[model samples]
Target chain A: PALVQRRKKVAMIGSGMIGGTMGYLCALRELADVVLYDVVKGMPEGKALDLSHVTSVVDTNVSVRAEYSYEAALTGADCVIVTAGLTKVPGSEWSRNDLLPFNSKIIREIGQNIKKYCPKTFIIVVTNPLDCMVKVMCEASGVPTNMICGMACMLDSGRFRRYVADALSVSPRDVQATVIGTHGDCMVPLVRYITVNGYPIQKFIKDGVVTEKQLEEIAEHTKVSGGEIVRFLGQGSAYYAPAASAVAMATSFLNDEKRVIPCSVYCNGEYGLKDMFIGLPAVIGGAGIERVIELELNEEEKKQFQKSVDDVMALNKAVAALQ
Target chain B: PALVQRRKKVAMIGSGMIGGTMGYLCALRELADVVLYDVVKGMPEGKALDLSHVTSVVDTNVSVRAEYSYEAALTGADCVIVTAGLTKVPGSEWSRNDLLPFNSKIIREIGQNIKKYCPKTFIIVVTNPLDCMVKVMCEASGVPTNMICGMACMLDSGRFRRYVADALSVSPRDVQATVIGTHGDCMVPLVRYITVNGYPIQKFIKDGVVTEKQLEEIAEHTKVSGGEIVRFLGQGSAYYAPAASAVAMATSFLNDEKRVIPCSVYCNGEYGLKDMFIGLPAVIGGAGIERVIELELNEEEKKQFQKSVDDVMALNKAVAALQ
Candidate 1:
């Protein structure tokens, strides 16, 4: 008698903006069977049942279940994705300072549960004021520092790729680039390193498809892209790109593909930053944060990158102040 | 002004077993913006909205909207998938002979709507008594026959592959084989041409990982796999594999990935079954049914395939009797 072995399982906490997007992509792609856990009853179950219905049309076998209990959902999870926290809403009159209290407390609770149940699972955080929340999550969870990290630069980079593709009038698939630093307005888009099909984007456009001023404008748009979408839709932030971006990270981890993705990592004298999480180009795989690629940057880009790091460090201080 | 183009859009009619699965996979993979249309108002809307919320945590931006109107949902659809009409329900006392009137009338109305609203879209049929339904959809819609084919062999072949994998204790991904002809018990599992990782299965199993009797049992299981699952789940049939099989067909069509997928097509005297719909190995891509591959089969497999073709021909005759 043959028995089917245990299939891949991902435990997703939080049914809010980023967490929901991750679950949707995981379910849509049939990446793995996912247990969507939330404290709110009817939220996750309603969502899971709905996704299961869509599975009838999409033709994927990825089973998605919604549960409210940690014991029911989080047991033996291959990866525990934490996206529970305050989301940045447009016109809220709240700064990054206002978000830390809510997110940090949520992170601590989630971390404690992960410590008790899924200590070995890789942790990917997408909470607001990400650098600070990620650090708090690690401390509360007692997971290895390397096992937990924040999704910062990947989403930031995807926005940059979209803008660059728009400027070039090409598909985003053709753009090759990276964004580094905090996943905020201060993030650095490495313009010099940007290429389209192995050719420098700057060299191909003599008439300037996107001038320096235009690039700056697009970068600003990239920074506030999520807020803009939420403003337009009147509810819920953007998930399509964000979900796909997170899935790419999870794919690298699950497939052990060793793909280099931009993520916020603890800077231990790397890029001259001492003790805070900052976005950098890093290779992520099964073991997590396999290697961080320290790029040699130009003077202006380096300054901007360092400034973004400093801003995140300040945000971390603000979060710590809440304690 | 930079503008972002929305992802691909797919519309599915019916939210039953196959249609729901296809919608789910598309939404899960973030493959497209999907609109699920069903006559039942709450079902599609509830399912779509629920998936929308899950996308928040999952980070997918692909939007799923449920609609009760063809005009609203089917406009500019890149693909229109049809999985409507009566399906086999166990313990219902309904036989294939009893299902013709209900399915044919349903398919004819659907085909008329497709012609009126979404004539340009590539259509896939997964309705019950699949071969007859494919012909009905094509004739009524006036779409190119190649663009409208039934999803029978792909699901059947996937089941076949699963059985072979279990019998040999090999991974399902390693099995490369196909089951052609009808989508039911009389379907032909091409044993002679079966290969695992480019090596013949018989050669690999010579060391006795699987016995001849076990191989026959596996083949029989492939033939009646759907019935077995329906027996257990009841009401609805298997959606996971069936939806996936159809999506694989749609993906190849949309992405222009020229790949071989087994599907039901106009026989055109290929197995001496002229003007009949039968499953065969065929190349599917952007153009849809780019080429059909003819396999040189051993005597037993060839005879089995011919018999499968005859079964479908008999089904066509039954359909003709109603006309």
Candidate 2:
């Protein structure tokens, strides 16, 4: 059977909760052969073994293997998702930026390993200090920037869509919302862009379906959604939504679907931003971040976007100081 | 929005890890509108809330709500999955029969409620003491036998196929295995029926692809796979595959795909048995257990099947004594 054929492979850099969920989803989706890479002696093995049985039940024949070393996990992998970093406690009043000192070394070293073992593998970074981590990963991996991006706005955007959908009493599929910029409090939720069943949300507002105050509250709620889950769990941060978000982006690239998704991607000149990692709408495909979608932001949204950019820049400075 | 329309609903009787996973998968797969029903305050709420965010990330439009009462959860649900009973630790020496004295009362009361509300809803039971619990459910609910089944052989079959795949160095998708009868020690593994890529495993054995000793070890491993995971976790029982297995059966019914899979379903004069719920191949669709596939068993398999049937009958007798 080994000589018969080989499936696409995905290497998850950590086998923690988020990584385990991501790896499980990756295998269940039959997106690729999943390799769970972790330093802990039995962590990856247990997660991988448990995950291995999941795909079989789903009727997908993909393999889930536990790898101890980066080389073993990354070799010939089609995609590598970096979930290997310290998790910041939500609602603990600690900023994701504060995680830079502890997690930067992990991401940077893993990126270097990515460069050595599988430069061609598309890297979707799920590590916190998301924007800064993506920048560090790029600095170390030197893989094309398009091939590596942070997973923030996608999860944030889903929360945005979820809240909006709940407000309109419609399905999330009927609502398309945007959350772009950094994955911080300053992140922008472009209310004007949200559409329900192909009709702009403003139409609903004009029809008295919902008021602006309610809409604003929904947006505010979206910003705090991640913290709400952590507060509820009283333990770990959310993993299900984060994993699904990363899987969607990776699936787009792996399946060559060219799906347009909001991701924290590299921006050279889009939105007049410099060579920095930022969250915006991008065309994700087999080639990874094939193109960025530049939608004109209103003056208010522009102000918010600028604030978010400055926050990322501030984090970037901190990440730089450590380097 | 409640006045607009309604999606098909799935009510899970518990909001534990297995129920949470099932709800998440049910929502992600867009199989139905999911309601997490639980006795614990905020348990289902938190699970439902976290799960509510998951579907959003996947672009699903369905709603996930927490229901505190049986009527609210089961009223108009199209499918109901029972994961409410106490979980048995895998490595524990206590027999599933020992659990019956505890879980049976919970399941029986639940079944009576199912009869009172949502009598038309197809029920997929995933509780432990699977064989006995299904009997308890049928006795209390009096829902059509075709409308209820136990989730056991599917997960067991996956483990069987997974082990065989590992031995042959093949993908689990390429291998289709069978595990019928009880969920416990005497559960029958119909090796004669196990096929790989539409060919019998005997072909591989004839070609020395694997030896009988290896195949027997695989079968034995399949029986103990659940314990293997629980032992490794040092606490929790296996949930991922169990949830997926239950979800697959529910999906087949909700989608009316009429998939043929081995499940512990009602048997009447099938396999020379009468009025007993046993694990065997059955076609599951909108009408529930549409039909049972009766395959002839070889001499050796017949003996194993008899042993398994005796185990279920033994469990059945114990259940009757309790009743």
Candidate 3:
């Protein structure tokens, strides 16, 4: 055995599909040692053990272990990703306020555990009613709002990029899109900022490859893309995309790449929001969500973003009642 | 959208948990354009759409789509990964030859499709009764044996690495252990070749860090590691690890890295086997399983390997009888 050097560690709050997949990616990237924490008895152990086997050949050097206790998983962690909340029932409808309390209560215990175990940890929350959950995590963990964020905006942007690439029949890598504001209904797809192969949206419009009306439809589809998978699967909602979205954010922070990604984080003054967690272009790097990159939104875009901010506050108010 | 300048294509024959995970990995790797094919109507489509969204932010410069028509997915694939087969019934014991025919028949249809659409494509079979499936795939596809392989020993070795690393309490990357031969109970763990940080097993034993008996226990656990996961998961057997394992193999070939991985391919004169597909250290490059790297086996290891060959011959005979 080689000498045990100073290696980075990450703790996953819930070792479900999304958590396990993110841990697996971290193992493959050799980014950090992963501890999978789950309330369920054997699930996390099985997943961590299975993930340990994955590194046997891939040589990620990172060790993964399962923890039934929060202290065991979160103590002295570099970063933490929370994915331990309930997904919506397929085809079920609820007021935005209906489900936030259930998931928020779940995060309360988890966040307090983080506050006790590792206060300085950078946290990325993947639980739904995402921006509301981000606020709960910050308050409960007693961590600075800068150290915690949510994954909805990043995931929304991914769906937006997919629709943009589909319209052009090109690779998704060529499409750099930022979907900000909030998740679900109020997710603002910034048509002006979307760039393909470093060319702005105007390049495509001038070339007649993608029409502006088509882009409008694409943005609408992006907002509801989560439901499309639920309808098609007829069972679970999307996990792979969200997991990937979160893993990329974790990767950037672990590597200190400082990539500008649309993550739901606390916007102190940017975009006219004060101390509210909304989706925005956040510069993520070594110290977690370092800063927000504000874009000059046009008059129409400003109204749209404000609508999302209002919805975010409504959900936050519903969940904040417990506090 | 950037110009599509003859991007490489890969066709996945199945898009289940393992298949979808592998596709998600390739999307993250940006290795090649991916087309997912499955007979089930909406499963592949749902998975492809989900995977496309995953790449929205990761920017792998690759495309993925679902196709009902085999011709559309497989027609020009540079590689094809076959994950289409019946997994074992959980906790049920069956005659070794009983389930072989059922999965073999499934591969036969898939193989014929590959033959019709892209006979020259490099093939990787993740379906089990693995070494036998490699033989069936070769016979059915009419492609030469060199262009095909299976993913059992690589996975077996991954398990072996995990156990070995656990024994040493070291990083897995520092432990370069290889387990070659048939999978499950018949695997041959070469104690001589098990190197930890370039130090052979003798170094660990001599240093009083690991006992010879402990080494034996590690090897036994590696052999049964898959069963451990099966027992722990209680529903789906290990897919995240297997998907990661397959994706690593796919990455090597796509990048032409020529990595030496223990894949199950046809053995010719290696280990005294002729016209048999067994697990060996295969150099996988752009040309697929280019050559097998032979290792010198001691008396006990050779005996263990021969027993595995006997079992492989028996399973291959049962599946081969279908011809």
* Candidate whose TM-score is highest: 3
Clashing pairs in 2: none
Residue-wise C-alpha lDDT for candidate 1, range B26-133, written one tens digit per residue:
755668878888776555754564444333323345667888887877787888888877775421135455788788878888888888888887888888788778
Interface RMSD of 3: 1.6
Model 2 misplaced stretches (Cα beyond 4 Å): A1-6, A91-98, B1-6, B91-98, B166-171, B271-275, B293-295, B316-323
Write down the worst ten-residue block by lDDT for model 2 chain B. B89-98
Top model by DockQ, which number?
3
- Model 2 residue A225 CA deviation in Å: 0.8
State the number of backbone clashes in model 1: 50
Candidate 3: which docking quality band? medium
lDDT of 3 by residue, A1-323 (tens): 78586678989888887888888888878888899988888878889888888787677778889988888999979889998877864321474446766788889888999999999989999887788888888889999887899988888888888888888877777888888887776789898888988889998899999988999898888888888888776667787888878888888887899988889888877877887788888899988888898889999999999888888888777766656
When sorted by DockQ, best at the front, the candidate numbers are 3, 2, 1
DockQ of each: 0.05, 0.53, 0.63
Best-performing candidate as measured by lDDT = 2
Each prediction's TM-score versus the true structure? 0.58, 0.92, 0.93
Candidate 2: Cα lDDT at A73: 94
The stretch of ten residues in a row with the least summed lDDT in candidate 2 chain A is A89-98
lDDT of 2 at A96: 35
TM-score: the better of candidates 2 and 3: 3
